[PDB]
Design a protein around this ligand. Structure first.
Ligand SMILES: [Zn+2]
Ligand SMILES: [Zn+2]
Ligand SMILES: [Zn+2]
Ligand SMILES: [Zn+2]
Ligand SMILES: [Zn+2]
Ligand SMILES: [Zn+2]
Ligand SMILES: [Zn+2]
Ligand SMILES: [Zn+2]
Lengths: 89, 89
């Protein structure tokens, strides 16, 4: 898909995030994308340890938003942080 | 606005969130909305104490997502949690 970016592009974004969260988070999931003009949008869930302070999890959020914006010109990300009970499977 | 919901509706959503976060968060900001068919979308920032564990902040996120979905049929929310340094002004 509908308003999603091309599946190929979503998977490039996924692979990029997966490399960037190594040792810093448990997983990224529920990637949802779309394009509007000069802009692309990504929202996803970043799964971390439940006892991770918001301030710490958020530092990683800022790092990721900047990394994504640079690696995918036009793309801006909104990140929803979750505890380990939200992990896939 | 552009793809935003009507300003009137955004403000109703804002007032609803502001009541719901009393004593539980510092503020909600950067409300961004849009409608696609039977669906409406909201993303916002929920500002809490930096030392708030992700697991705690996320419990409030689930409460808010459910409250919004019930009070605004069709609406689904993505919440980005932030520490106190992200507060307005
Ligand atoms: Zn999601
Ligand atoms: Zn999730
Ligand atoms: Zn836990
Ligand atoms: Zn969640
Ligand atoms: Zn925002
Ligand atoms: Zn913010
Ligand atoms: Zn602080
Ligand atoms: Zn942020």
């Amino acid at each position: 898909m509908d308003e999603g970016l091309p599946p190929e592009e979503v998977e490039r974004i996924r692979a990029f995030l997966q490399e960037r969260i190594r040792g810093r988070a448990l997983e990224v999931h529920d990637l949802k994308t779309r394009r509007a003009g000069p802009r692309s949008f990504l929202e996803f869930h970043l799964v971390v340890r439940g006892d991770t302070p918001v301030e710490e999890a958020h530092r990683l959020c800022d790092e990721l938003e900047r990394a994504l914006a640079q690696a995918f010109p036009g793309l801006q990300a909104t990140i929803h942080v979750e505890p380990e009970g939200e992990r896939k499977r």
